[model samples]
Target: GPLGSDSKKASHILIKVKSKKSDKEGLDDKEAKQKAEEIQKEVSKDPSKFGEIAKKESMDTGSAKKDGELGYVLKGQTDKDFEKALFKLKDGEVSEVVKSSFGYHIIKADK
Candidate 1:
């Protein structure tokens, strides 16, 4: 079970790519991506603000409450797009907005 126990860890902030999700109301894809890029610009200026901004802006409540922490996950255990973007990052680095079915994620590879 070593393989199962071995996992990758990352943190992420999500800004919903608007749709008919009802909960995501108001904004459309263009609006959502525009907001994400704005946040990205802010984060780039002060990476330490990622957690604070994420809690305030991330659409994914589950992780947002934990400061955008998605915890550790084994390969293939997450959405294909999420897993793909997660792995591409190096430790302590944040990614550009990556789109997945759930929305757009600004990921940070912590491990």
Candidate 2:
């Protein structure tokens, strides 16, 4: 248990939404949700575009620069909603838009 025995690697494109909990400026909830939906549609059509879209659109700059790579995350390491959506993904598969405290996410599970 010293290491991450149940870790999973996932990449995601985050669309930050404006909310009382967020300090950074961002799109309104409606706009962010719509944008996430648009990105999801594009990524679903061509999975290969996920990284590129992440680079251009993701509000999470740290991961966006790395093509949305979150590296390895354990069950308790991320937001509960995020972990739920991420853990549900099949390998190399994209997830439906998921909303968390951070914002909306389009998740992809990796090997």
Candidate 3:
């Protein structure tokens, strides 16, 4: 019970973006950012649609299949940027588009 307080359950929709400095093939940074913004807007309007949207739009197939469910994670168990943003959110709160090495993420703190 005590340890549970130190963990959080979060969901996310990731949009993979190709960085200008990297040659990886994917949506350009700007395009990906725009897409994330659009999705964020939709999710903010109706948070209940998050899992549905994540299934359709999230780039991370592994999590996408589970409707973006990341289960429970401790502070150090995730990307630094993601962890920081995730912990700051209250239950059922959505975060702004967050960028990490993996991609841009629309995070939902599921509690």
Candidate 4:
């Protein structure tokens, strides 16, 4: 029910606000899982180019240098967005670009 001006339920506070940690989607550029898959194809041709894409295109600077390789991350240590896509990938595989609160991501789960 609505928190109304005249009702007995008006005794409580009613508010809607976005939390600092709330999930969001906005980026200078975002690539989705589908796009990541496509990019992966191009990358597989020569992984030397991986650094180029990671540095120029990745929103995550931490692993972008390694081409999104967060080696042996502890289960709870990674960001939710990072973890979700990371776990989905097989050894030596890359995910389609996925969005998280931080921005767009391209994950590669290591063996």
lDDT by candidate, in order shown:
0.76, 0.84, 0.85, 0.45
Give each model a TM-score. Answer: 0.79, 0.85, 0.86, 0.49
What tens-digit string does per-residue lDDT give for candidate 4 at 35-103? 445656665554456556655555455555555444455565656775666555544555545555543
In model 4, how large is the Cα lDDT of residue 12? Answer: 7
- lDDT per residue, candidate 3, 16-91, as tens digits? 8875756554588888889999999998777789889999988888998998888887778878888888888888
Between candidates 2 and 3, which one is better according to TM-score?
A: 3
Candidate structures ordered by TM-score, highest first:
3, 2, 1, 4
Task: Output the number of the lDDT-best candidate.
Answer: 3
**Which model, 1 or 3, shows the larger lDDT?**
3
lDDT of 1 at 36: 82
| TM-score quality measure for candidate 1 | 0.79
Model 3 residue 74 distance off true place after TM-score fit, in angstroms: 1.4
Error of 4 at 36 (Å): 6.6
Report lDDT (Cα) of residue 109, candidate 1: 73
Report the number of backbone clashes for model 1: 0
Tell me the spans in candidate 3 whose CA falls farther than 4 Å from its real position. 1-4, 19-25
- Cα lDDT for residue 100, candidate 1: 77
Deviation in angstroms for 17 in model 3? 1.2
Compose the digit string of candidate 1's lDDT tens values, residues 1-111: 354334677778877665665653435788888888898888756667888998998888889899888778688787777777767766667777778786677777774
Number of the candidate with higher TM-score, 1 or 3: 3
Candidate 1 Cα outliers beyond 4 Å, as residue runs:
1-6, 20-26
**C-alpha positional error of residue 107 in candidate 3 after TM-score superposition, expressed in Å:** 0.5
